[PDB]
A paper describes a structure:
[name] ([name]-[name]-2) encodes a [name] ([name], [name], 3CLpro) that is essential for virus replication. [name] cleaves coronavirus polyprotein 1a and 1ab at 11 junctions with a conserved Gln residue at the P1 site, a feature with no known human analogs. The essential function in coronavirus replication, together with the absence of closely related homologs in humans, identifies [name] as an attractive antiviral drug target. The [name]-[name]-2 [name] inhibitor, nirmatrelvir, was found and developed as the oral COVID-19 treatment Paxlovid (nirmatrelvir/ritonavir).
The crystal structures of the [name] mutants with the greatest reductions in susceptibility to nirmatrelvir were determined in the presence or absence of nirmatrelvir, including [name], A173V, A173V+T304I, T21I+[name]+T304I, T21I+T304I, and L50F+T304I. Single mutations T304I, T21I, L50F, and T135I had minimum impact on nirmatrelvir Ki values, while the [name] and A173V mutations led to 46- or 16-fold increases in Ki over WT enzyme, respectively. Overall, the cocrystal structure of the [name] [name] mutant complexed with nirmatrelvir was similar to the WT [name]/nirmatrelvir complex. It was noted that the hydrogen bond interaction between adduct imine nitrogen and G143 backbone NH could be significantly weaker in the [name] mutant than in WT [name] because the distance between the imine nitrogen and G143 NH hydrogen is 2.08 Å in the WT [name], while the distance in the [name] and T21I+[name]+T304I mutants was 2.80 Å (34). In WT enzyme, the S144 side-chain hydroxyl group forms hydrogen bond interaction with the L141 backbone carbonyl group and stabilizes the loop. Because the [name] mutant lacks this hydrogen bond interaction, the loop comprising L141-S144 could be less structured compared to WT and consequently lead to the weaker hydrogen bond interaction between the adduct imine and G143 NH. This could explain the decreased enthalpic contribution in the [name] mutant enzyme binding as observed by ITC. The ITC experiment showed that the binding potency loss in the A173V mutant compared to WT is due to an entropic effect, while the binding potency loss in the [name] mutation is primarily due to changes in the enthalpic contribution to binding. The A173V and [name] mutant enzymes were also affected, with 5.7- and 3.9-fold reductions in kcat/KM, respectively.
Author numbering:
A (entry chain A), B (entry chain A): 1 to 305
């Protein structure tokens, strides 16, 4: 029993973290095979960040202007290339700790673990969801850029996020490992706003199934609803519309508990309209939306890596 | 910015997990140097767990009755010993991945990371507090026993917990690495209850300082209080009494924010007496008590390992 926000074990990713310095700017890099990936703004001075021309700035940089350190050991840089918002530094040594890996661009609503680093050294690990507005609710300070987000499927690490910036609301933005931002964000120090932050309905439903499996079931009411009637309610509370694809992904949890997805929708509708009346669900006084159906199954079944 | 429940990077601990089987019972073991530590109930059948005489049961076991596996490789068991509620298996190979480590018995209110394992393989990592009633609010299924709790201080791993059981309220109980239970618990399948679950006042205060540092400061009121007047309020809400030692540990956060601890106590008093009126603090609709002052400083300063 019990249900906690759980991150993947970080060991495979810890062995890939390096420190990248260009001039006076230092941040984290990810060393896989003979390439180090890092945010391209490592080449900026604080002034350049206000309105950078990355192509012009990078032209003043040679391989010897990038200092890459793994622990106390220096890596020799033998090439450099800019791919979208990431810089790729070719080094003369393949990382001996390179895990089996792939680069994935995740969909909004999916979750991943973040290994927060400073100066190439891991500080901690936490779980994040890619929100529908393509921001994450992270915890990052100066020097955190280059910290990565990932998922594990037994022995394969799927890297999906690299940290680049913080928006005025305190939420975070970054790119996939090809350097393409999630969302409309640009790597420039100018006012940018994320857009309306909607709730991931299929994740709230998965978390209510997690609650039932854990014996927390006071909220189960005597009503049912339809997809269109539920969505009329959900859109009023800034919830994402629920589709048959979402009902299908909830299939294993609905089958395990015997509770039809539309019956759970009707319980969610009552919780939205009436609130929780001072009660809690899985130790929370709010409806939690950062657990995917996969996270609930995995945790309630003990999937290992 | 941002404040999340953050676990330590788990790599150093992942390299210590092994699988221990005795008869038909399998659980996790911790391999450090040439010793594997695991819960002594690995020697029980399901029936034995109802009222076990561990001394008599262990006498029917020889070294060859313990199967220890690290990945696909078998470790040779050359000795065994029971120390309190843990079994210590001497193996013929020192773990080549043994980190710098120590065994610590933590105090109630302190936090640690849990690397949840099944069959000697890591499943995930989460942060826990040792509650004042000596239980933890974890997430564990059958086969999780032997999963450990730890903290890291740069390169040294301090192991503080080994998982043994779940209580009727859904909370968890276990021992330090010397096999002594935290709390009054015994490793027997009989009705046991944890006792009143009080709130860790110094941790709630540290989390309110984390909120202020993050710009969430709607709750700061115009009052102050005394330690005795605050404690009269706190004891009514099942909060632990606050002492000058706690005020001293809060010193760095009070100095950073300029907010005196007794002023923060008066804001906490109003939150207890009035509730949050539907508002949130750091994304929570409840007062969070599983962040120590050290966790807040470390996260707000970027301490690395
Ligand atoms: C990389 N190490 C930091 C991480 C930031 C620092 C504070 N918390 C974080 O997540 N990245 C930056 O400092 C990036 C970097 C320039 C400016 N910047 C920002 O995150 C700024 N944000 C914005 O300008 C905004 F609002 F548009 F998103 C900052 C004001 C410092 C938070 C570049 C090149 C984007
Ligand atoms: C070890 N792998 C499991 C972990 C348990 C299983 C469910 N969630 C967990 O944390 N440990 C046990 O099964 C231990 C073990 C016998 C019984 N047991 C329990 O946790 C039981 N609890 C109690 O009897 C109680 F309430 F007193 F704490 C159980 C009913 C299975 C939850 C021994 C030797 C204590």
């Amino acid at each position: 029993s019990g249900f906690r926000k759980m991150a993947f074990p970080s060991g495979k990713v810890e062995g890939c973290m390096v420190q990248v310095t260009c001039g006076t700017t230092t941040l984290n890099g990810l060393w896989l095979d003979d390439v180090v990936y890092c945010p391209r703004h490592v080449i900026c001075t604080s002034e350049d960040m206000l309105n950078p021309n990355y192509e012009d700035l990078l032209i003043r940089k040679s391989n010897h202007n990038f200092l890459v350190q793994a622990g106390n050991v220096q890596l020799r840089v033998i090439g450099h290339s800019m791919q979208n918002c990431v810089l790729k530094l070719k080094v003369d040594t393949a990382n001996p700790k390179t895990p089996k890996y792939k680069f994935v661009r995740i969909q909004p609503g999916q979750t991943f673990s973040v290994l927060a680093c400073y100066n190439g050294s891991p500080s901690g690990v936490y779980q994040c969801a890619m929100r529908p507005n393509f921001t994450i609710k992270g915890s990052f300070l100066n020097g955190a850029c280059g910290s990565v987000g990932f998922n594990i499927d037994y022995d394969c690490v799927s890297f999906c996020y690299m940290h680049h910036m913080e928006l005025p609301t305190g939420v975070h933005a970054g790119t996939d490992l090809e350097g393409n931002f999630y969302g409309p964000f640009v790597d420039r120090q100018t006012a940018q706003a994320a857009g309306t932050d909607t709730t991931i309905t299929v994740n709230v439903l998965a978390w209510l199934y997690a609650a039932v499996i854990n014996g927390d079931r006071w909220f189960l009411n005597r009503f049912t609803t339809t997809l269109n009637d539920f969505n009329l309610v959900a859109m009023k509370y800034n919830y994402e519309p629920l589709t048959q694809d979402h009902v299908d992904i909830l299939g294993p949890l609905s089958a395990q508990t015997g509770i039809a997805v539309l019956d759970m929708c009707a319980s969610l509708k009552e919780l939205l309209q009436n609130g929780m009346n001072g009660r809690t669900i899985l130790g929370s006084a709010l409806l939690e939306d950062e657990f995917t159906p996969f996270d609930v199954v995995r945790q309630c079944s003990g999937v290992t890596f």
